Amino acid sequence: HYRNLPFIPTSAMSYDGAWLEELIEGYQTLAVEGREMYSLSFETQDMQVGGVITNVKYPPRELTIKYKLEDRDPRVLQEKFDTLKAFLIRQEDVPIIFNDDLEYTFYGRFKTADNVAGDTNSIISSFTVLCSDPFKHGKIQSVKNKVIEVLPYPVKPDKLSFKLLTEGLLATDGNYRLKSSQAKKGDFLEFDFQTGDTFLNGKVNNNLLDLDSDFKNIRLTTGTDFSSSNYELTIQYRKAVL
Amino acid sequence: MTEHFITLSTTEPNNNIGIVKLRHADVNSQAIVAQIVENGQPKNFEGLQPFFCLMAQEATGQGVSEESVVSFDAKNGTLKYVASDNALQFVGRNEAYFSFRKQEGGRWIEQFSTRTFHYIVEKSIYSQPFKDSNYWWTFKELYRIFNKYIEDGKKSWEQFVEANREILESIDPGGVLLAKVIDIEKIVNEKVPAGFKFVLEHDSEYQPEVKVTSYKNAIGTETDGFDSGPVFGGGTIYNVPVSLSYDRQKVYVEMPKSYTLAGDIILIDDGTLLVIKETQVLCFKMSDAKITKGYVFVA
Amino acid sequence: MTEHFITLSTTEPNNNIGIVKLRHADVNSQAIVAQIVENGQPKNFEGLQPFFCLMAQEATGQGVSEESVVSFDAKNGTLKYVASDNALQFVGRNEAYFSFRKQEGGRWIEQFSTRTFHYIVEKSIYSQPFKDSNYWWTFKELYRIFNKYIEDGKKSWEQFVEANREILESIDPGGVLLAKVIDIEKIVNEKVPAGFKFVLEHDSEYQPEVKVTSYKNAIGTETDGFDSGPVFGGGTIYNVPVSLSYDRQKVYVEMPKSYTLAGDIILIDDGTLLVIKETQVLCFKMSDAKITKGYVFVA
Amino acid sequence: MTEHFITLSTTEPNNNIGIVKLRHADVNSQAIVAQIVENGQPKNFEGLQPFFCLMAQEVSEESVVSFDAKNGTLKYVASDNALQFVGRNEAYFSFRKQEGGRWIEQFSTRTFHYIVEKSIYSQPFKDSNYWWTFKELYRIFNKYIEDGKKSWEQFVEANREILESIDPGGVLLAKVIDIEKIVNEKVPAGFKFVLEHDSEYQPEVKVTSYKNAIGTETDGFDSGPVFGGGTIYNVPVSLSYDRQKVYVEMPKSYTLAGDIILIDDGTLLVIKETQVLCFKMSDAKITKGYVFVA
């Protein structure tokens, strides 16, 4: 009995849906740092006594990943890296999931690789993956009218499916007001795709759909309610965690 | 019922991406809704029977775990699998996938399967072993033993009465008579209206219809005050069989021996009267007339 | 069935391909669609049969697989290999390649192979048991049993003849029937087509008509050079009786024993072939098809 | 016969017990040997009969025949009801005593799990190594053997059929006579005719034999049984060629020495009373016709 089984470690990284340790023989993810703890950026205008916070920013975090690549033949080892680089070096952002944190999904890209030795034939180093959005996103959820789920952070939605009943559209939760004058009255669907543009029934209507004083920067809290007798709204969001 | 949505591929090298976590106690509720995709487009498994394959830890063989999926649409590549008792039996971190096979005469022809997804089962109050009567038990073990005691106990009692009735009735020429007379007596003391008689005086010159009902632990008749009884608002209501006899402005209500109750007579504003003795209440409802007086027959 | 689209190069390493992941128990479903490339351009393996070649594990030296690929397009350089039981034998990482060869009889004419690619086999609920290889033992046992038939067959025959020796001696007095049978044999060896068998390979998919003629002293076949023979142009032309048998792109031409001629096989670039042994020529004329190869039948 | 030796307890839950795998469609009678334990020590079930009880898959009772009441060891053979569901099956052993014609439970062992696996892969297993070339060499070599021996077996059977079975003297002579008859009529060897022609090449000659043809009947015109000629037989020919000469070899039964009539085209006849032998030649004209003399 002999089987050359690919080993997947406890904190293995899944870059673009594929495991690198499965892709490259000899590769192994040792440690992943930066995801467990997050730091904040602060703007402060100090005075005579103390100092008040002007603005709180959320910097884009990079995850440093420690790996081990080994092969007996130096020629093959070089070829193994050539594939590792080709897979990592990406022009657009990529979905990253961890073997210990399978629920959430990060969205980053390969940034900088740490110095690599030119001997031994058993190399151990690291590389950072810059995540433009510092939040990890879980499963996509479709909820009608109001969000009652325990949300740890305010979430920007993904899609807002409105279905009118009255003449005009005036979506409100108390803080945000979404308004659309001269809307399609008499039961007509209006898609508000947060990660793109707006739709009217089937056709794309990005220019006219929303009014001048409408909102597209809306954020969902643990107790956000939009339920009204004027429209039947279906929220589509993903739980965001840092 | 609770649904778990997945978009499973057959080309994309996922291996572990996709986690479905369920609880041990989940008979017919948690169902898996899966979308089958090949090269970015939905896969049509028409003619191939879908199967839920589970790779359970320390419970492996040739047929580790395989269950035929009943709810499925092969035209669009969608299926729905409700987690069975076998699926929820294996508590822990398991791996699962969906198979699709076509077989001629027992033997296989074609079999394609999706990528592996994690299938973890969380321990419940029913799966977790607990200490009872100096021994360690699981719910499933005790629940089976207790229901056996009830099942075998009912059967042994049914046989106890049956065997004993054959003793005095089948072994005696005149003993048959003995049991039948005792049996027929209680029927007459419960179902035939003869043993108890109550008089109801009214205002009507005619024959008013009377309906009698018996119930215990009624509203405000319970021993330890309001809502202290086992069944709130009254227990079991029995429609009392009656034999009616009438005189001028008098109704003689004849009832069985079992409904004999000597308590306090309470007259309500209309054609309704009650006889209350602690928790036991006997209700008298009269139509087309007003009750003026009520008392047990004595002449 | 599941399709795995990959591009394989003969001149470049196959490292940049995606993860080829297949399930252990999948029978004939997991198909690999491979595009063959040579120096960047697609390779035309026209006239060459593709072969899936799986290399055995260095540790045990087991798991070699030389499999003939059924579906393939030689013109564009694409092949669709469906993974077989021997391909999905080992759960884990596997080293394989595709080889293309052109075969004749038994010997190889030309062969080229793609560079090694790697694929992973996923664990299934089923685990196929594999018998240890005994290709040498099966050939030895066969050879032994066949030689046992020769040894036992010789004895059984020798005893049969000797037991019936007396009636065999008294079968024909003098040789009246024997002298007749030799005169019939004389005819059957010249007029019946049963002895000499010649194979003609053709390009046609159908059954081409073959006409055979025999003649001596044709132009350039005479012993003492050009125009040295008794009859200039050739002697008597004999129409050879034929019993035609057909297979795909093969014509089995049966001819009488007297026309047996083992000489030089000369193929003119059309529907004509010659067998020349000194002055004697055996001509093979074929209609509506071109002769590719000609040889005497051997089994 | 496969056996599984395990130890069961009535106090402690049976879960840490060894893994017991049982084949579904197994030929061999699978058996389980269990040692009954009460508080970690054997229990004597003297007077009590063990019962294999299978739990419902969302219930079957089977009496155990082989058991030792003194030592607490019982042997249960796996039945078709036991090997019903493929996967982890739950069962237990119940000890009963008959009182009043009905079995009553005294004590029972705690439930244990046993796995039932499918017998999917057949006995002729696939070889670890696969070689197309070797099995192709095998089928070819086995083809030579099988096809070789059957031709010899046909030879040896045909020899004993006439030689040892009936009477050699008769059958051997009987076979020769029909063979020489067939060769005399079907094989083209006996009669040889020469046709001289105008062509430089090899013209195709077709020979036909027919009796009672037009104007060749015995009693004049339309006197024969079939008007216009009888049955037309296609004469098998062996063609031979020289410069402006065709040597037509025909069977010895078709021999005919009669009047040679040459028509004004590619046709010649040989007429002897009613029997006519026709010579039809393509793409050439017959100039002379005569029997070959040797």
Side-chain angles (χ1 to χ4, degrees), chain C residues 62-64 89 131 191 237, chain D residues 118 128-130 238 241 249:
Chain C
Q62 297 272 199
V64 201
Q89 181 182 160
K131 191 180 183 176
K191 304 294 166 178
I237 301 101
Chain D
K118 272 186 277 183
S128 57
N129 297 327
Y130 188 95
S238 181
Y241 300 91
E249 205 161 30

Side-chain angles (χ1 to χ4, degrees), chain A residues 6 8 14 16-19 22 97 99 102-103 139, chain B residues 3-5 12-17 19 21 93 118:
Chain A
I8 300 149
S14 168
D16 203 45
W19 303 101
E22 205 167 36
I97 314 156
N99 200 58
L102 291 154
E103 264 193 307
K139 185 175 77 169
Chain B
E3 39 197 22
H4 298 266
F5 297 98
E12 193 189 312
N14 298 143
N15 186 347
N16 299 126
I17 290 94
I19 186 156
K21 44 196 148 290
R93 309 199 92 261
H118 274 86

Side-chain angles (χ1 to χ4, degrees), chain C residues 93-105:
Chain C
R93 285 165 169 146
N94 294 302
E95 269 209 289
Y97 72 91
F98 286 96
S99 186
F100 311 84
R101 87 174 91 103
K102 130 159 105 218
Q103 277 256 229
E104 76 165 302

Side-chain angles (χ1 to χ4, degrees), chain C residues 24-25 51 61-68 84-86 89 101 103 108 126-135 138-139 142-143 146 149 157 160 164 167-168 171 177 180-181 184 187 191-192 235-239 299, chain D residues 118 120-121 125-135 137-142 144-145 149-150 152-153 155-156 159-160 163-164 168-169 172-173 176-177 179-180 183 187-189 202 204 238-242 247 249:
Chain C
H24 174 77
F51 280 90
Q62 297 272 199
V64 201
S65 187
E66 183 196 45
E67 292 184 8
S68 191
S84 178
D85 299 64
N86 282 103
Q89 181 182 160
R101 87 174 91 103
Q103 277 256 229
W108 297 341
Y126 307 99
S127 56
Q128 190 174 6
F130 281 83
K131 191 180 183 176
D132 293 40
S133 195
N134 45 248
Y135 278 78
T138 48
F139 254 92
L142 174 48
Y143 186 69
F146 171 73
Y149 180 83
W157 177 253
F160 173 76
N164 297 49
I167 47 96
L168 286 175
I171 196 178
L177 284 163
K180 291 174 65 175
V181 169
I184 300 166
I187 297 159
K191 304 294 166 178
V192 187
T236 314
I237 301 101
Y238 301 95
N239 281 18
Chain D
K118 272 186 277 183
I120 170 208
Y121 301 108
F125 299 109
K126 284 192 183 182
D127 294 51
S128 57
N129 297 327
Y130 188 95
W131 286 97
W132 176 87
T133 54
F134 302 149
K135 65 172 63 201
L137 284 167
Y138 195 92
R139 60 159 291 272
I140 285 163
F141 183 59
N142 188 244
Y144 180 82
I145 291 164
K149 74 163 81 179
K150 73 182 272 79
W152 172 249
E153 279 172 355
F155 189 93
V156 77
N159 273 238
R160 68 113 277 177
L163 209 118
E164 104 170 41
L172 194 276
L173 187 271
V176 169
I177 57 95
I179 279 166
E180 183 178 2
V183 174
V187 182
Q202 297 77 46
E204 282 285 311
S238 181
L239 299 153
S240 195
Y241 300 91
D242 270 349
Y247 306 98
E249 205 161 30

Side-chain angles (χ1 to χ4, degrees), chain C residues 188-189 192-198 243 253-260 296-297:
Chain C
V188 175
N189 291 347
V192 187
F196 181 67
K197 201 171 186 179
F198 203 83
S243 187
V253 186
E254 217 154 31
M255 284 166 274
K257 288 183 184 72
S258 296
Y259 296 99
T260 306
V296 186
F297 184 73

Side-chain angles (χ1 to χ4, degrees), chain B residues 98 125 146 155 162-163 197 205 210 257 267 289 294:
Chain B
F98 287 99
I125 196 181
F146 295 165
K155 267 136 94 186
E162 193 189 309
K197 204 167 182 186
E205 222 73 23
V210 183
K257 264 278 192 289
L267 208 140

